[PDB]
Amino acid sequence: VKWPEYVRVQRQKKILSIRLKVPPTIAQFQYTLDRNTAAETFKLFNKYRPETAAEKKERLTKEAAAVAEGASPKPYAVKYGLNHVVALIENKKAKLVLIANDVDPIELVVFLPALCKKMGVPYAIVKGKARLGTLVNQKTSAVAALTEVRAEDEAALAKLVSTIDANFADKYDEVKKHWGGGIL
């Protein structure tokens, strides 16, 4: 019996990560926002999908056409860029931060939750970088953050932040102990 080499390699990697002891800085993920609150966050974030290329192009063409014949505030949108997210973090401008748990280079995201908690900025870990990508008109971003929001959604954002603090931040603060990967 034989299977493709890459399939065997990835299966071995999975069964090794399941069995290899990792420092608490690793395995800080795998304790993630529950399905309920994750769906609520997606619903809240689904209303602030960044304008896609087609939408921006059509809007600009329409504006130009009106101008050719001869005021609104900044459109609130989710911030996802890792460099931009880490810049909103450490500056206190960020209100809600989402972290993908399935980033290929783990080192790129290990320090993000620690920095977020050090700066006292709410943060949440959500399964699937694709899910963040699906709502940002990209394949994946590995991170998502929120900025100034419409007054209508301010109460929803505050409630979501409180729920996240009650569910994940406070409950899983013990994640520092219990070195992951100890399953027999």
Binding site: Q12, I15, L16, R19, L20, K21, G182, L184
Partner: protein, 94 residues
Amino acid sequence: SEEEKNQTKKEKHSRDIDIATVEAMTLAHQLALGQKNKHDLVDEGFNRYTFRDTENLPDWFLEDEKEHSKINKPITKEAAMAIKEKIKAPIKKV
């Protein structure tokens, strides 16, 4: 026969601790003479391979780690001589 079984326990432990490598022989030689006492070896016994769990990992992974987790350190001819004598086991052969 309780003592008989106990004797075999020490024999198994001794067989798993006897020096069998050139690096081990050099370490034993340095420990015997005053070059590196127990404290010096303990201080030197911390390197890249320390803090690595191996009881739970699969055998096919430990084997890969076994043959790729060694350090080549300066060996000594005097120590290398001792291991050769230890490995030593005739009229017909003569």
